Amino acid sequence: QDPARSVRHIAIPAHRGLITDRNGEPLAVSTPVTTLWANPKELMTAKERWPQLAAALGQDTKLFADRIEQNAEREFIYLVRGLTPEQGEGVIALKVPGVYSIEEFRRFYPAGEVVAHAVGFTDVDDRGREGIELAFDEWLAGVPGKRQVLKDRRGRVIKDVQVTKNAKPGKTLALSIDLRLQYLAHRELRNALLENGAKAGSLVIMDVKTGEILAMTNQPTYNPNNRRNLQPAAMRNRAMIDVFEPGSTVKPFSMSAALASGRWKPSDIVDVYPGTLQIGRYTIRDVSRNSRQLDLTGILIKSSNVGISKIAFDIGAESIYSVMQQVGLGQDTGLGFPGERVGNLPNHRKWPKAETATLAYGYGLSVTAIQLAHAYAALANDGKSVPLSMTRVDRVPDGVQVISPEVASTVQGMLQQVVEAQGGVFRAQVPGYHAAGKSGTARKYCSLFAGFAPATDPRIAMVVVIDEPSKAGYFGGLVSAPVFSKVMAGALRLMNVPPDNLPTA
Predict the structure, then answer these.
(1) Cα radius of gyration (the chain)
(2) Which of 158, 226, 239, 454 is deepest in the core (most CB within 10 A)?
């Protein structure tokens, strides 16, 4: 009943942890800001100061006054949040009764749009909303402290008795991303899309030895420092959320299972004429139908669905399902990234022929760009899968050998021929190096290229996706391969990887 005083507690906003790239470049920085709040009941006793205060906050004279006149019985109000320290001391300099300030922090993202979807962003209350910012919120947010104070019935902050709890600052986080490579990838994906007249795309780069995601860029991107356009669509982290059917880009996994069965070898011949194969009512169709006999490498260069469907019937879907599952296609990445999709690797008790075939040439299963890159990383790491990481890997974990070193080495050699050989994906070539990869057309249609280099001793795996390229030529090759070429050459140079395609030793 009208207590003269009352003790009250306010929490001391914690300094949010630094996000850096793998080499300590800053990607998200807690920067000093100032929030202004008021005691209406103290403001009510200085009404002739309001126009000046309202002016200083950028508010309307008559609206500001309404606000205070109708929160007059109330004790607590916000005026403005988040402004610079000088501007906070500027309004403070008016010495308007009832105006108090509190020190806050707000995120600045120095690289901005370049690494937007990976870093994510925080909300108005400095809490993580997307990306790493949310994925690692507990680590990055420390602990809000608490300052014990005194106030009257009507709440004028008389005196700070003590601070009940010291606030704990959040911890620093080093990402797996290399901003030099991120920058390169971002720049070349962008530059590519506008030349093709493409709506959107993705590019993922991985270290095949460590599981580290060295780059993850999507187009379109947005400036996290300027979120005012609210765009909802252009904030898609496409590399992790756009599920697609991967097409011919999974044939090397079918081929891995064929080479492991004991029934197939590189020089084996398969007759794919007339470019179609009837199974009951359903007809398997090749996109290009000017072939009869093709060796195993030829099935890859030609993207022969018929060819891989006959290999699958012979070895069994179960062998193919097994490799695909073990390399992470349709599997939970364990990255805990918000909105991350898992896609779908169907299983069967009894696979019919049609499902066996469609699995083998990469339809019916759906995946993300990140899972594909991860699969390709395993193949490139001499058949050994390492867990995906968006954070810097200091101690490389034990991997699982999923494809035998021998088989993995043969599949690599074949994919090198796909890039090199006559009728191959020659605009995937990387100057000074052998490179290995596979093109495809994804059904979301997208131009896909997946691959790795150096081919004879792999370090880097890479997936390029270009959504709906707008020119006469619109296959899996013509668009994605030159991007892989350029981003791969750059990333190899940045990481000082030795050329393996000199005048041979």
Answers:
(1) 29
(2) 239
